Amino acid sequence: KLLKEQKYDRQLRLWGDHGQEALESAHVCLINATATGTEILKNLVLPGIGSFTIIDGNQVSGEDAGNNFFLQRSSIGKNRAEAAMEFLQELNSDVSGSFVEESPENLLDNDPSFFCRFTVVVATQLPESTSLRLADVLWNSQIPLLICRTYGLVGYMRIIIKEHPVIESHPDNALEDLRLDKPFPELREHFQSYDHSHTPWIVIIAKYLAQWYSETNGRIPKTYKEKEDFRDLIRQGILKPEDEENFEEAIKNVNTALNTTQIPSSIEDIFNDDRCINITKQTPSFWILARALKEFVAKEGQGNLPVRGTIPDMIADSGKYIKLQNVYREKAKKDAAAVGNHVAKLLQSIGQAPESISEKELKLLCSNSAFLRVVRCRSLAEEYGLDTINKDEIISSMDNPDNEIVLYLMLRAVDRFHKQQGRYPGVSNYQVEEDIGKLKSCLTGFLQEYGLSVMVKDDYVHEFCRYGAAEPHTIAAFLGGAAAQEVIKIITKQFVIFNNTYIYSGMSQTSATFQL
Template identity: 65%
Template sequence: MAATKASKEQKYDRQLRLWGDHGQEELENAHVCLINSTASGTEILKNLVLPGIGSFTIVDGHKVSGEDVGNNFFLSNNSIGRNRAQAATELLQELNTDVSGNFVEESPDKLLDNDPEFFHRFTLVIGVQLPESTCLRLGSVLWNANVPFLVCRTYGLVGYMRLVVKEHTVIESHPDNALEDLRLDQPFAELKSHIQSYDLEGMGKKDHGHTPWIIIVAKYLEKWFSEVILLRIMLIRAAGCMRPLEVATLSVDDLFNGEQCNDITSQTPAFWVMTRAVREFVQNDGRGNLPVRGSIPDMIADSEKFINLQNVYREKAMQDASVVSKHVESLLQSVGKPSESISEQDIKLFCKNAAFLRVVRCRSLAEEYSVETVNKDEITCTMDSADGEMVLYLMLRSVDRFYQQHSRYPGVYNYQVEEDISKLKLCVNSLLQEYSLNVSVKDDYIHEFCRYGAAEPHTVASFLGGSAAQEAIKLITRQFVPFNNTFIYNAMSQTTATFQL
């Protein structure tokens, strides 16, 4: 067992530094469904199989064609005529023996007709190169089952992703350049006592040079507060606009005021139970402050002084987490759930990251596509530039409309490219008219999308595969913040954009 763990640590060394043992465990317990093993689909799975996804299932009713072999590294000439899901599964499994691969020789539409609950079993469903009608049907099934759905598409020199999830909570958001939680403006009793134990005036030069800078700053802040802040408080009070100090960040404050935080039931997810417990801590025990994070940055100091200071913060963090744990226990008891249903380890992790909690809520595909609920403001605002990424989104919607009318995509046959240009232009105009969008699309884009012929170039598919796998790992590990909700990649200009549609 120890040998197996050691070999895994060696094998997955780099990624463990990103999402830790607990993130890797979530990854290894996940079961991902990929619909359609096209070039984009296999690139996504490649980037999930290599880091050790637990298992995957490919749903694909197509047979391998010569065109598939031409742009897909996971299909060979020997695969032609075989089921595409089976052929891709065999080669993908060779990348990592820890991963279990399965395949279903069926189209997603048939599964939706005969067994829609088939898709409920997965941690995440990734749909690749799907027609609009299939996307909407599958999106509705997964939305009602609370299964995250990631729609991916490569169309010529355009990459597209759409995340569909009701609510995705993130504890470890890993923000860039996060400020340290040192509490120098409001030092807790143990920190005050530790700071007062230092006599800077009586120190020699050597001792002073090896004193943690936190102590020095705290000493002078205390002096500055006593001289300046009292005067400022008097002036503010005199003006009648005194406000309580708000330490909790704005995003966390929004969570505290949310409906899920107020209405705790036996069905409430652990995230919201712990959020409510932290809110009660802030309002009572913390006196407006979140639990202490318990970490300090590296600094020049001798080992003994640094460790002593570090222990002050760590012990306070443990005390705060213990208080939050009691609030959690009380909340669980009030709804008839055992206190063990949320572990101490989870509570400590939650408290450590309380300032960085994030919740992503996406709109459903039905809302995006409905005339009544389409986000017209987002579309019109981002169409200020006639060459922005939003025009690519409108073109993708238009080629889907073309497919609905003609059962094929524009330009798939060379001899019909010129004929399809006028047909696609009609689709673009009808889309803009149906949604009452007062924007225009250049003819150049209509011509370009007809020339694409719904091709799936491997260079674009590989970029999209890496991007989609990254978002999938965010969803599975519940670490880092996924995009919300539409992502467009323009391979012509090498630019990307996200929109909330």
């Protein structure tokens, strides 16, 4: 019981207990159990994912046991899905594994509805046909799909979720919601209420800010100067030349503390989304909370989001800091209640129970009010569609003969070649020579079929033939790590997922995200 918390400590410090819960309740579906799939799954079993299921029809080959850390020589000839399941199973006894000795295609035929069991579906090393088909089925089924592929020194990764909202965005670095520019009553009263180093830097800036406001009525914009001059105003207040570290600290925070209140552009857009504007019994929890946030802004929020209620640390008297800290804490608590009301009303006008949304959810939302984020991925169909193909992005990126998107195009060509030739370029050594041409033909065919006026160095046509469609472990491993975390993001809904196709080049040790 408590033994788990010891085993998962290092990660609990990242997504906390609730994240861990989400994870231990999920069920993942890995399509092919190659190195890529095996590595991705490895990074999910270790963390303690609830349960997984491997769907592989293929038999473990010689080269399969050669690049997979979860298939031994002893399992060559057996089912690749079952073989891997056993070895992966060993990593964590708290994870329950399962397998299906059939192909994706087979399942998509005899039973499409099968994938509705899964929280997420990770597919690896699939051919165009199977992807487009699976992508389609799952898109309609509302199932998150992540297509992963290792080809030579290239890592491919495309995520497909119609809409993924996230509250606990977890931003590295944000501005403090101190709001000196638009103080609230309680805050103002606190400042009026006023061991020289024992005084919080905020109260310091507030005092001199008030003074400056009298002798001006000005807020102190004029970056380069006014702020710089505001500093000198603070300096002329240091105890006869005693020291004052916090004073000098306040002077440094002046670069921040001035304007720290304004609704984030990204949130404005959430507010303006049809999903937020037009609510219905259909509307999911996230959007109802977003509306409540918007309503708040309009009414008691008076133009801004609920007060965060958290302040940075600051050299100051033990009791003074704690008092200051409560002013925000208490205010925040209030704004939260206000937002809460708007929720209940909204729920009622929809017919849902006022308690359809926990207080926990409410409190968390209000803390992250300024960091909400929504991601929406284009369907795989829209990308492959002749009219919808986002050529603006492709052509634009291709302005660099070596932009990672070269690799994307090459992958499409390789796919064309495969659809065409029924096999991949240069798999056998002697085929290389010949295929280099046949491949460029497909490349050009592909580029024309979509009207993509782009120049692709012939070098890349060579390289991919050299690759012989190999699945190098170190490459598969890289992808395995990145993919797993995106999957964990989907499950926990705790961070921000990349938007659409991610491309990694082991050659240059570089990568980029494309589309959207």
